[PDB]
Amino acid sequence: MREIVHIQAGQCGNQIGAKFWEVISDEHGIDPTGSYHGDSDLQLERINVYYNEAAGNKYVPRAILVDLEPGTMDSVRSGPFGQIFRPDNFVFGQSGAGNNWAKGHYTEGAELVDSVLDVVRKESESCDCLQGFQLTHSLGGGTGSGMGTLLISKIREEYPDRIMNTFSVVPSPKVSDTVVEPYNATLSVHQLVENTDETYCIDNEALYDICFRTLKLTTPTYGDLNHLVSATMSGVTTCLRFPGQLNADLRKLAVNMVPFPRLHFFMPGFAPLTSRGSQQYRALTVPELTQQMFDAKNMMAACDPRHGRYLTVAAVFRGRMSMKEVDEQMLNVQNKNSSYFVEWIPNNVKTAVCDIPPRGLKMSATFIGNSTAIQELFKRISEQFTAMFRRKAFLHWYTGEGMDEMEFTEAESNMNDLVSEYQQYQ
Amino acid sequence: MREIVHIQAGQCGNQIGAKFWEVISDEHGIDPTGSYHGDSDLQLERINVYYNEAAGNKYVPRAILVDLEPGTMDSVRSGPFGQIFRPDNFVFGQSGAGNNWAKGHYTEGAELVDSVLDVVRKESESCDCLQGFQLTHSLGGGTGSGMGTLLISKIREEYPDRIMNTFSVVPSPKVSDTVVEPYNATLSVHQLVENTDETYCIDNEALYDICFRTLKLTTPTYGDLNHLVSATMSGVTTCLRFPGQLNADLRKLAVNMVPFPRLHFFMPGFAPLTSRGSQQYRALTVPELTQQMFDAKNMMAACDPRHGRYLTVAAVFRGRMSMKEVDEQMLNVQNKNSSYFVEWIPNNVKTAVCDIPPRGLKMSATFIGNSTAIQELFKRISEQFTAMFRRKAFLHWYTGEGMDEMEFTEAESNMNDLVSEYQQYQ
Amino acid sequence: MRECISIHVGQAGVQIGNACWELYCLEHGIQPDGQMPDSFNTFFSETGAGKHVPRAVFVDLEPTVIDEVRTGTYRQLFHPEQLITGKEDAANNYARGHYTIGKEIIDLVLDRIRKLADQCTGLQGFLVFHSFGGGTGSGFTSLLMERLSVDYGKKSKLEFSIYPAPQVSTAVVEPYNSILTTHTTLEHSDCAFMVDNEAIYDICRRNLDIERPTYTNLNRLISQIVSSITASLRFDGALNVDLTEFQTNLVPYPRIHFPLATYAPVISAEKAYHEQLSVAEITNACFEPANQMVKCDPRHGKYMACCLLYRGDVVPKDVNAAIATIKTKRSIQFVDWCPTGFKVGINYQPPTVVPGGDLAKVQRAVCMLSNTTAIAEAWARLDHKFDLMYAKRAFVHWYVGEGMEEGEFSEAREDMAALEKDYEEVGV
Ligand SMILES: CC(=O)O[C@H]1[C@H]2[C@H]([C@@H]3[C@@H](O)[C@@H]4[C@H]([C@H](C)C[C@]5(O)OC(=O)[C@@](C)(O)[C@]45C)[C@@]3(C)[C@H]1OC(C)=O)[C@@H](O)C(=O)[C@H]1C[C@@H]3O[C@@H]3[C@H](OC(C)=O)[C@]21C
């Protein structure tokens, strides 16, 4: 009965959404033609949360794909598992943003947001009782950031009572990729403060460190990482689809995680992680999973956990387990590290268990932490902004398209507000 | 109606107790399954001295096993006749002491004392009117001597008017089996002079000479020596369980032997002792028993019994006998050897006769002597101890646990006090 | 439920551990793949379903022997995390094994020790094999021993050290290594057995009737001695010992803790047919001086503490008679103030022989450990070598260029003279 539609913006978002629908069609046991070849009865009774039926026993995935560059749309159309989308969904323009936030927010949005809003109105009208939407984009470029944030503000002023998820990557400390990065990054944070319930963050280089030292691969690729972001997404949404001994959908996690409205930036993690060679020797228990969970090496963000204090922890498990064990081990991890958690929040852990594991494993576990130390990341963003804002470099390209300096100052002011709000409770 | 619970402490007393429950369970006719299969009704009117009937006519013994290394408990439990012990009784630690009396007394004893006292408190409150407690420990090692010492101190703090039996193998004149042995012997005697009503001293070398020069054995193993100790224990307490013509329970013996309340170290012995080679050349009437009893080389202590005089003698007989023969030949034995006996105690015999024999033989007898010649063994302890105390050898493994030097000086003065008492009365 | 974790440091340690783990995996019937077609938890961890892991850490700062292991036939057995490898050898220098290069690898092996200590309950001690004359095999041993005696506190620790021979020499800086290592390990280690090479050479040449030994034969002997020690833990016996026993029988004062180990019988298969082996002749043959594993004269002192472990089907009355007829002789004199210097141990399991090895199926075996006196005369010999290499200030710049001061050698010489004089005072 609960219903979630999908909207993919940006290149990185389009690729990880292709991999998202890939792992969803592999978890739910269906075929790239849309036809059914599954085995169990559990995989069809909850299919209304991500798909829709059609005249002729055909299934449509519930997604809308937005961009401005038709090359990536040709890429997801030509490849495998590009058949299942409906051809009324592939909406784009012809111009492109060129990694410029002002053009994507103030010029191309006026041409595209009308059609996208009409189609998402029809699709949200097609469903019975909607829970929320989730988008995938980045925080570095021009198309994904600006078009996603504009769509999210329109969606918040349209539906004021539903949840939002955003699986968005954030900039890296060691090596950058784009020169115009901190401008659109700070402006995107300025919109995501206002228009979104919850948003997890990914850093690329921590994914590189995980894929190097723990997975032990010779050739790390973009798709592999995309699959790790995908496995996080599936392991978060895995309670709306299968029954369990203690279920927890997304609004329950939203009200368990944030204590305050503006403290809504999380860090995810996956478990268990082992390579091909070293696979057989160590076991698959709740001790090994809970040990591999709480580490600085498991964290999929460029932030050290033990430089700050955890506020909340939500651990969503998958498999067939034993409950008193995981509660006793949560008690053990709470008793071991007393300096690492908030003192006025007692029993800082939240536990969820679902039955059906991901196919190929006997057990799995997803971690979501809310720890304040990510202000350090905000520091190494916002200070950098001041450097460029000391010399006013690259600015007239944004300025000629209808944008002023005062909104840059107010967006930096809001970023200052959030980093000092993290700094107060520390 | 008179009840005795059983505690085994250490390794040596544990193996002795395994053979002891073997012998008693064979004698009363009950099977290792717990179901009864004896022949008469004479057994089952008196089974409540040791066992309990439990809900579906299966019987359990009243035993609590105590050690600090688990493998002894595994060797008892997995072996035959290991089913009838109730698994709530097995209480042990995990570290072990290993010939450190301070470790067997001060440190691990405070870890196991409350659990063993709780189980024995339930076992004592389950009973009607208990007569005595019995413990089996060794005088050489750490966990046996130390935990038996602390257990006896706690029990006589708890129960003030219940007697204590204690069977203790005593260190050897020829070759020891542990290196720190006189320290263990001196402290164990320092507490056994304080808190015990009766106790016995057993040597290993006397058992070796018994199995060599009278039995003609070629391959003696430790189970067989433990069978001899089991035979002496059953011969002492066969009067509580079966009818008598001059009956003698434990309190009769306790008020029989001791003239002064410190001199309660006995030397026991058993008769007959027959080989299958020279079985035919003997008859079996009461002169054979009374001549093999009052014997030099048949004693179960490595002290020549005619190295002094006797104080008191008790003799418990088993079989269908004639009483006039018994007391006239006891007066005959006291008539033959006038020099070997204290004159200021006249009538230096104490007798008892019960009906049932051990399984297979007709007549048997148990000899118990309180003599003074055992003072020689006391000398060969304390002399040795003084030599080590003259050089402060091996003290730091005790001293780093919590023991001080004044303990050793007090214990040495106590041992020289005890040999002053034994030299006072001859 | 009784555990023990073994570490291997240096080249002598990793090859002698190759032989020891060969004997261990041969012993309980386990294939080298790590599967078997309920007591061996005492040295192994269980892996999920149908697999076993040994408890070992092979730490070497020179990668070639670790690569020889990983290419060797025991490749599938261990866990590939537990083979910690540095980047540069020590080149027989004590400062490079204690200070300069080895300090970069101590965090990984300490995390490995702390991770292997978490999977067990009643951990009893460590058994670290190491050599004296080498650089990394003594310097890193000092660093790990000091760090573990700081960290764990009150648990046991036993070592196996290769004794540098008086006559035979391979390296030239070996008195420096032994003197500084004994200077720094005297306080913290509990009891360390000493074993020389040249006595193993002589008992190989004379008793087993061999002409030319390869290094694997000496390692087979030392591995058989190790198995004979811990066979009272791996199974059961009529009169059993464990690892927390020997400290109360072998170490009188907290300084003198240096025993020498011996084995019996040392025979070939052709000498084993024409002699029926009673307990009396082998217990007497423990005390012939040509079969002691250290080049020393036991007739030049006294015997302070003496422990015996038996293996095979031996009844105890003849054991007690054999010790009684041992003590009554004249040549084997004992110390005055220690009248009972005997600690006896018997196990039911008979030993097994390695195929392609040098032992025949003998029903019995004796291990004898002795803390005797006259070994310290050998100390004087070793100390005398140090005097030569300090009289002309030989090789001092290769040591002081790595972060050492000159007063440490004088403090080491003072400590060794103090140890020898404590020894001779206690003796005389
Ligand atoms: C941990 C692992 O190796 O998983 C592989 C996947 C498989 C990945 C597969 O997608 C590989 C990936 C490779 C590591 C990378 C890859 O070649 O490039 C990509 O972009 C991937 C991720 O799509 C490609 C094609 C693989 C091999 C792997 O993806 C990685 C390295 O995360 C995936 O297809 C499966 O079927 C999984 C099924 C069982 O769960 C296990 C494995 O994944 C998990 C979550 O444990 C899979 C065998």
Ligand SMILES: CC(=O)O[C@H]1[C@H]2[C@H]([C@@H]3[C@@H](O)[C@@H]4[C@H]([C@H](C)C[C@]5(O)OC(=O)[C@@](C)(O)[C@]45C)[C@@]3(C)[C@H]1OC(C)=O)[C@@H](O)C(=O)[C@H]1C[C@@H]3O[C@@H]3[C@H](OC(C)=O)[C@]21C
């Ligand atoms: C005494 C003797 O040599 O006969 C044996 C026992 C028998 C002993 C038996 O238990 C043997 C023991 C062996 C000497 C040792 C033994 O193998 O190991 C043990 O722990 C024993 C004592 O239980 C074992 C299994 C035996 C042979 C012996 O037990 C000993 C040595 O006390 C025992 O089972 C009997 O039934 C006895 C009955 C008849 O009285 C004789 C014999 O005992 C007496 C009282 O002399 C027995 C046949």
Ligand SMILES: Nc1nc2c(ncn2[C@@H]2O[C@H](COP(=O)(O)CP(=O)(O)OP(=O)(O)O)[C@@H](O)[C@H]2O)c(=O)[nH]1
């Ligand atoms: N995990 C992945 N991250 C990616 C992938 N492709 C890009 N990225 C990341 O996305 C970051 C942001 O890219 P953008 O969305 O800004 C590209 P933009 O929309 O500005 O331009 P166009 O692609 O021309 O529309 C980029 O710096 C990379 O760090 C991918 O395949 N996988």
Ligand SMILES: Nc1nc2c(ncn2[C@@H]2O[C@H](COP(=O)(O)CP(=O)(O)OP(=O)(O)O)[C@@H](O)[C@H]2O)c(=O)[nH]1
């Ligand atoms: N009659 C027996 N005496 C035994 C047996 N095993 C050992 N002993 C005696 O043990 C005596 C020394 O005491 P122990 O070492 O047994 C007591 P221990 O220190 O081993 O106890 P733990 O600390 O619990 O290990 C020695 O004189 C042996 O003759 C046995 O099976 N039977």
Ligand SMILES: Nc1nc2c(ncn2[C@@H]2O[C@H](COP(=O)(O)OP(=O)(O)OP(=O)(O)O)[C@@H](O)[C@H]2O)c(=O)[nH]1
């Ligand atoms: N019993 C025995 N001794 C060995 C063996 N191999 C080497 N040794 C001895 O090792 C001693 C030298 O110390 P090593 O441990 O080899 O030197 P190292 O610790 O590796 O130092 P680096 O060379 O810098 O790596 C020599 O005296 C050898 O006798 C062996 O296989 N068996």
Ligand SMILES: [Mg+2]
């Ligand atoms: Mg080397």
